[PDB]
Amino acid sequence: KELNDLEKKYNAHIGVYALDTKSGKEVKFNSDKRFAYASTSKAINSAILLEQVPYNKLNKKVHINKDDIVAYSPILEKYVGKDITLKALIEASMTYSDNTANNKIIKEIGGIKKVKQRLKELGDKVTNPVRYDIELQYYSPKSKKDTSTPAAFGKTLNKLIANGKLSKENKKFLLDLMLNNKSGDTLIKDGVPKDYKVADKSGQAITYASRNDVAFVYPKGQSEPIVLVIFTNKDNKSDKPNDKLISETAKSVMKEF
DSSP: OOHHHHHHHHTOEEEEEEEETTTTEEEEESTTSOEEOGGGHHHHHHHHHTTTSOGGGTTOEEEOOTTTOOSOOTTGGGGTTSEEEHHHHHHHHHHSOOHHHHHHHHHHHTOHHHHHHHHHHTTOOSOOOOSOTTGGGOOOTTOOTTEEOHHHHHHHHIIIIITSSOOHHHHHHHHHHHHHOGGGTTTHHHHSOTTSEEEEEEEEOSSTTOEEEEEEEEOTTOSSOEEEEEEEEOSSTTOOOOTHHHHHHHHHHHTTO
């Protein structure tokens, strides 16, 4: 199909960047337009921490209190006044999309300031982390805050996870979480061949029907993944998105590989 066609069909904007890490073949559609990344940034935050904490040390604990709790913290709100391991912070952020775990994880890394720096180090001069959850969820087409382009996020995900400095165990750890994440089944996992394995982290901002999905897709037969970044939005602030849009964009894009 055509993505321009999928744009008209859904009356939505599509941004796509896909890189088959075996061949280095890229597919691009509005890959340089900025979209609110929202909760897909949880996968970047998690990987940055995993670069600095060995797998055997993930049992290390951090204290959680009332001032840490932010909205929509399905797991972490039960830890008020208690301690939690870095392993469970990552599992909560990635699987349940827990905002507090993520914020805690950003704090452990050193804060936005330190996240922003590691990005520049990877050569990503586009991804712009500014606010914490959930204020990062309030998207405005007029602001660059908490946005990235599909080409930039995509490349950052490849140098961090697919071909970065993560160990075998931490990398398996991060990826299993993304393979068993039941929250992304209506997205990229919905539009790719059943033969393929999809390890994703979805996202959805509060405004402009901003719905995203970033995944590592493993074609039956290939062990190297295809990094796939699908960002979408609409023209009105209160527009609701339709998940079938990411599903169908994934279907078409996989036809290039």
